[PDB]
Design a binder for this molecule. Sequence first.
Ligand code: CL
Ligand code: CL
Lengths: 81, 83, 96, 211, 99, 98
Amino acid sequence: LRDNIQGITKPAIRRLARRGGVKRISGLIYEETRGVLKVFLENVIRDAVTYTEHAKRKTVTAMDVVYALKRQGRTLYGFGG
Amino acid sequence: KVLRDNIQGITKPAIRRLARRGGVKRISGLIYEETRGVLKVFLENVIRDAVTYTEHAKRKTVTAMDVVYALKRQGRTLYGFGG
Amino acid sequence: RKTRKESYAIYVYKVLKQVHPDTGISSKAMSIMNSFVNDVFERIAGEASRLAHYNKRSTITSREIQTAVRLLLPGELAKHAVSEGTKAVTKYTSAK
Amino acid sequence: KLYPAIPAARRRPIRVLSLFDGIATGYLVLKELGIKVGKYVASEVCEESIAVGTVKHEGNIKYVNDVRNITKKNIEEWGPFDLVIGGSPEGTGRLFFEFYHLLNYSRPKEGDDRPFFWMFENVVAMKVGDKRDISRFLECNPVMIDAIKVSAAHRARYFWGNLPGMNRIFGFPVHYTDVSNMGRGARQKLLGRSWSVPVIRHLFAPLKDYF
Amino acid sequence: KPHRYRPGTVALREIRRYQKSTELLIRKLPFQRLVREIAQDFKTDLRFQSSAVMALQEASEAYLVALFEDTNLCAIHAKRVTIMPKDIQLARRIRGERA
Amino acid sequence: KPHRYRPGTVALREIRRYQKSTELLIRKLPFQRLVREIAQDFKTDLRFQSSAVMALQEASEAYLVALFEDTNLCAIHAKRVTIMPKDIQLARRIRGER
DNA sequence: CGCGTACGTGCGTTTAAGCGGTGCTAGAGCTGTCTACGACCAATTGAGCGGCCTCGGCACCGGGATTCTCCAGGGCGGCCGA
DNA sequence: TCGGCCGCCCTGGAGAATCCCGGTGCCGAGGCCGCTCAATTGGTCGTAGACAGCTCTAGCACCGCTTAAACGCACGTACGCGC
Ligand SMILES: [Cl-]
Ligand SMILES: [Cl-]
């Protein structure tokens, strides 16, 4: 239950960087990117779980993640709204 | 009288003082024109919103509350003049 | 089992047929347009409510929505939307 | 260079040669100049402009089936032309060189006092080598007029021509903008109609003092 | 006899291929495991809709693609074509997320 | 010849002096003229409270100081101590105001 | 690591910001009247939503043209150095 | 005086990838039907706001000193920049 951040693989971060337009990727990128992604997911899942707590539910709906991302100024379309 | 050429009123030493408060050691020469441009576009957006708030308030004097509401709306909340 | 979640889906499709009569739209893109309408709606009604609280007023009229549009839409998009809105309020106030 | 203006007591109708145009702009804008047409000759490779002309423009226009058909004999037979215009709705170079070749047939010789006016249009997405070559061929410099005063799109345009007052006179209006805003297809008319009607009447404004 | 390309050409080819595509680049199940692992430290026995994890993945990949865009601009600005954690830290610092 | 300092020492001295101070660095009256000039292109005959122009000046100087902070970080990142319009454009691009 | 250039420092010059005065008046701001505009209530009904269906637009496998990539060779000086 | 290797320019042809073009399946979007509940209309009050008037605050305008700071010029050396 600790190698789940390693599930964000080196090919997957490379594909993401290719979509971002990156030509060359140093080796120290990948651990840093796993870290930054983990911090972003910490903030988002923290807010979404807070919203789940307020609704007295046990499951996290997609509307909760939409409301969380909307609160954090990154509005997401296509999941209700 | 139509006011013109007031962007030059943001003088070179004032931009240098602003650079010093930002921690800048050395300043190239095109910084001053670029900075006058960026400050002009910033004041364009902010004064545009404040003028809009004046328009809807049926007034002709831009209050400090209008500029506070405008800066706050753009995600830069200014303390000291209300809100 | 009786719960109807409201949406703007038929209205987005009607405006699409009134713009592109031969082009359809998927349900994911329909959801994205629905959430865009809901979002922009909430933004304009938000700004209008804020303006009404600012000016010590409790009645949201077309002028509040108008200056909220002039705030929220960037420039020429705001000019076209204020013209289209004032045209529809003119047509509304002098209809059958 | 300034050309002398004939007084408005001599009301002769304008002979126009419009070469490439999707929706026929020049004859309609000349109808809303307030002056009459002498000769308006159009041509198009495709049949779309021919269909638009045979439906809308009531048959007061002499059409040619192909642009590769107009010779020197057709120009000398269909009267001398006062205006020559080339626009568009890698064939842009082909359009320009057909325009310049038909322009050489319609230009008056050394000795004629007939007022001659021409115009060529294309956007700033041209290669700069094609721009400097067209500047060499036409012996005139283009003007880069941007859609930033009346619009916000990044679609600027170079202009070529023999038009009096075309350097920096164009600015932003508020009344024409306001009257042109009232549409739900406001920016589609901005992308097409705003390039069709207002800019062209703005540039061909002083021709009514001539005729 | 075996053919081999230069690095830049396959790199640019992948840049084009993934800027044309729209599919999710992180796999679904390890991202789901990461989401459950991070959630675990807030409340035990949490459940997730499938569309919730899909929304998390859409926003996470879009966030990292905008991040790598800014990171590439930092690299190019520093006369490099290779991104570095320097560039990621500069990007996040200018965006205001260093907290 | 009289005493003359190195550039870095008076530069760092001014960096220290102005990061300690709190007063407005842009002068009041040319900023007021700039505000009236920019306002002029929205409505003729606009009036301004003094505290409104002071609020504009506080926010404008704070914005430009945060801009020069990000610009200095762009300069330092590019192995330079000189800020450039490259650095200003990079800062505004990453911040999202381009 | 070398070239250079262009920015910072210092001094003299001078432009104007700032402060201190008053006069005036446009306009922010508060008060009274009322009226017209919106909340509140019931009937009704037709527009909008759940369910279904079918079918054609989209996804996908395969083939050929093509289209850029890249390396091999041919000529070409050219550079010496053994 | 010598030709043996060595980087440059051009060009040609393998070669993998990609675009184009049909052929077939498939499944979700377009369309039709019930129905049900909220949109609409008519009517009634209540009070929020449009409007007139008065006031009195401060915002703009002008002028006079006053030095604070901006502008310009030389210069030199430290960092930008190319290799
Ligand atoms: Cl209203
Ligand atoms: Cl690093």
